[PDB]
Structure formats: C-alpha cells, structure tokens
From Swiss-Prot:
Pathway: Amino-acid biosynthesis; L-lysine biosynthesis via DAP pathway; DL-2,6-diaminopimelate from LL-2,6-diaminopimelate: step 1/1. This is Diaminopimelate epimerase. InterPro entries: DAP_epimerase_AS, DAP_epimerase_DapF. Inhibited by LL-aziridino (LL-AziDAP), DL-aziridino (DL-AziDAP). Also inhibited by (2S,3R,6S)-2,6-diamino-3-fluoropimelate (L,L-3-fluoro-DAP) and (2R,3S,6S)-2,6-diamino-3-fluoropimelate (D,L-3-fluoro-DAP). GO terms for biological process: lysine biosynthetic process via diaminopimelate. It comes from Haemophilus influenzae (strain ATCC 51907 / DSM 11121 / KW20 / Rd). Changing C217A: Inactive as epimerase. The gene is dapF. Homodimer (Potential). Previously DapF has been proposed to be a monomer, however it seems that it adopts a dimeric structure. NCBIfam families: DapF. The active site is at C73, C217.
Amino acid sequence: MQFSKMHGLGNDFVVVDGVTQNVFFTPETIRRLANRHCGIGFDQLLIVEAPYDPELDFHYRIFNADGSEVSQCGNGARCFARFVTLKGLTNKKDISVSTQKGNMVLTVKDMNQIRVNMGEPIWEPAKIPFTANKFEKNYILRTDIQTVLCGAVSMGNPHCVVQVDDIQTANVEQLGPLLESHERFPERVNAGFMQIINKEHIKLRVYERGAGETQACGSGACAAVAVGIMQGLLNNNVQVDLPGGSLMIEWNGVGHPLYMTGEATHIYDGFITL
C-alpha cells in the first residue's frame, strides 16, 4: 500500500488513496503506524474514499493517532486538496468533498494555497445548540471560577469564543474544560480563546471538546473571526495565528459563506506492506 506524507499547521499527516486501494485500518493498525519509532509516525491519518453521491467529488475521513475516527476542525482539508491534485485524482480547481460532518468546497489557488468554503456561520442559539433566551453578540457565561463574556457560533460544530488580554497567559487549562462541558451547551462546545492585535490580525487557542487543546483547529479559527466580525471588532479578511500555524480567514457578513485559506506541504511518498 502506497501513501504520501504531508504537513500543515504544525500537524503532519499520512494521506492514503482509498479510491484505488481497498485499504482499511483498525485502531491497532493506526496506533502502530502512528508510532514515531516503529511505524511511519504521524499526528493524523486521512483516507481519500470514493463518495457514494454523484453530487460530490470525494469523501475523506481523518483519524487520530489513537485510532479513533475523528471529525472536527476541518483538519487536513488542504492536505486532501493538495494530495488529490498532485496524484492526479482530479483536474478541477473546485472540489466538493464530504466528511463525517456535512461537506465543503475547496478551491486550489494558483498561489498553491487552498481556499475552503465553510459555508455560513449559524447564529441561532437553539441551532448551535446553545441555551439562550435570544441571540446576543455577547452572552454571559458563568463558571465556578468566574463569569465570562463570549460569542456562540456554528460551522457544523458548536463554538464559544472568549477574548483575552494575552494569549499566552489565558487560563485555558482551567476555563477551557469549564466552558467545554457547560450546562448551557447541550452537546458541549469548542472553547476558543482569542487575543485581538489588529482589526485584521488575531492570535488564538482552541480547546476542542472531548479532546482539549491541540496544535490547530480550523473551525475554531473560523468561529473566532466570525464573532469578531459580528461584534464589529474585526474587519473582513483576518489572519489567525494558531499554535500550529497561520490561516487567512475571509467573510463578508451574513448572507455570505465563510472562506478559510491555508496551505499544505507534501514531504514524500512511501510504500508499506500491510
């Protein structure tokens, strides 16, 4: 079985062409391959599978180094785009791929960058879901250690954004878990902590629900910029500085989809029996 190693936003992946290969991994296998000393070594592994829908071009499923089939933050979306074109699985500049959570449209820019369409951010409280009387630009959340102000959005997963004085000293370790599993969030939520530098530049740290703080969470970057733009604190087209890397977020208000631009680098190709 042949594969290709790539990386983006501090995370290195192992992409596999499951469209022409009948591959199938089990938690064990993945955990074994994910081993940096006895395996291929990688943070995540995604498989390019055929979409059983004439509407979509491809379908893919990311995997945690643990072997669990994750599905959040739209990770490896650019790696999938770059891989799919490099190996010549398509020739279209615009690709419609689906994941465990809905789907998205990616476009390969001439700048070799990959622009992703995350659709329009959902604000309806009950549609996030988030228990709130009505929509507010600033919801008051109360935690055991303190009451905070935040914004709630939705790309497909629930998102809670909190502004901080300094990204490095943000009590993410304590507050993150507090917000992640809050009662006002029926299905938990992704707690994002962002620090505003300019009206077009912000630093952020996300605490993925059921996972915790990771290298980078695409979705989190989108949500952060959304509330920022809705709050009128950020301009359209904002750069997001995540621990793993940077991202170019674009959005022109309600009635417009939210675009997320980033890049993926191909390192090498490999072959492994079984």
